[PDB]
Each structure stands twice: as C-alpha cells, then as structure tokens.
C-alpha cells in the first residue's frame, strides 16, 4: 500500500470509510491512517478533505473518493488500480 495506484477504487473507499467512522483502536491509529491518506492522495488540502470541507463539498466517504479521483485525473497524477 505504497501509492494510490496500488489500491483499487473499492479498496480506497474502504480506507476512507474507516477514517470517516474513526473505526480504530486508538487516536494514534487514526492519525496514522490520516497521514497515510494525505501521502497517497498528494492533494493540497490534505486532511481538510476529510475534516474541514469547503462549503458544499460532499464529505461522505464516496464524496471524498470522488474529490480525490477527479483531482488526480485533472492534475496529471496516476489513478487507481484497474
């Protein structure tokens, strides 16, 4: 799990859902997943995509996945595994 091209879209949605639901054993584990998410996406907003959305953005797990997918596609980045 070293790049976003290592994840299928469904696998990435799983990761994001876990984060959004705080489905972890400690705050430390949650912080680690968030850091991982920021490293995978390379998105300039970082954790704000999950925790500080801009007005009207869809901050559900599927909405965050869409925002990442579209940003990567439009900004010359590799996409999800087939």
């Amino acid at each position: 799990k070293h790049s976003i091209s290592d994840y299928t879209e469904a696998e990435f949605l799983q990761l994001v859902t876990t984060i959004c639901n705080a489905d972890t054993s400690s705050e430390e584990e949650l912080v680690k997943l968030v850091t991982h998410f920021e490293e995978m996406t390379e998105h300039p907003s970082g954790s704000d995509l999950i925790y500080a959305p801009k007005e009207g953005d869809d901050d559900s797990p599927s909405g965050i996945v869409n925002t990442v997918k579209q940003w990567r596609a439009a900004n010359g980045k590799s996409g999800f595994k087939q």
């Binding site: 959004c20 705080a22 705050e27 968030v34 954790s47 704000d48 925790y51």
Partner: protein, 132 residues
C-alpha cells in the same frame, strides 16, 4: 514521575462560547473550556489528565451547541473520546488534533484539573505559546 498522571477532581467555571469556539483555539492563549462542559465535569474524579481530556471530548460529542460545528468525521472522532482534527494550516507534523494547554504551567504550580486554568489550542498555537 509526572504530576499530570496523579488522580484529582475537576474544578472551575469555564466561560460562555459560541460557534467560533474552535476558531479561537489558534489565537492568543487558546479558547476557554466551555461553561457547559465545566458544569458536567465539575466534581468528577479523574485518574490522569489524559482521562480528563477524553471526558472533555466525549462531552463535546454530546453537546448539540458544541458538536454542530464539527463535520461528520470529526463527530465520529469525538464520540470515541478522541481530540478532533484541526484545519491543515494549524497542524505541525504528527500533531494534527486540538491540544489541551495549562495557562499557568503545571511545572510552575498550575492546577492540573482546574478548568479555569485549561485552554483548547491548535498544535501551531500551542508550540508558539511554549516558545514565548
């Protein structure tokens, strides 16, 4: 071998806060503990400051006036007693969540569980306070 790990009872009044409560965390000495939270926690015994911290965020999760300014993901976090994530621009490395600060430091005889001595800070602000 740390004062903050000795049991004590919570005391203090806190202050009225509004929607900009957590916006205040990145400024000055940080945001106060809300009066509404102080009403709930006063007189409860805590086995460590970390246990007090957990209780603050659980009460935040239960309070409609405080929780309504957190998005669904941050709501999930505070429901588990975790500190919520700040905006990216207030984070510093692996410090990404709101931090509880003692206005008069414990090392200088500040009270550990007096909520009038406690503030909510961002990582960026808390680091700057402790450096002047």
């Amino acid at each position: 071998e740390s004062k903050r790990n000795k049991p004590g009872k919570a005391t203090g009044k806190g202050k009225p806060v509004g929607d900009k409560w957590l916006d205040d965390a990145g400024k000055d000495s940080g945001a106060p503990i809300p009066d509404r939270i102080a009403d709930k926690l006063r007189d409860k015994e805590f086995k460590s400051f970390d246990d007090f911290r957990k209780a603050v965020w659980e009460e935040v999760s239960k309070d409609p006036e405080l929780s309504k300014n957190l998005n669904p993901s941050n709501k999930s976090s505070v429901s588990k007693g975790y500190s919520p994530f700040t905006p990216k621009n207030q984070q510093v490395g692996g410090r990404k969540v709101y931090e509880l600060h003692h206005d008069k430091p414990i090392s200088q005889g500040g009270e550990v569980y007096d909520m009038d001595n406690i503030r909510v800070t961002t990582p960026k602000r808390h680091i700057d306070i402790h450096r002047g």
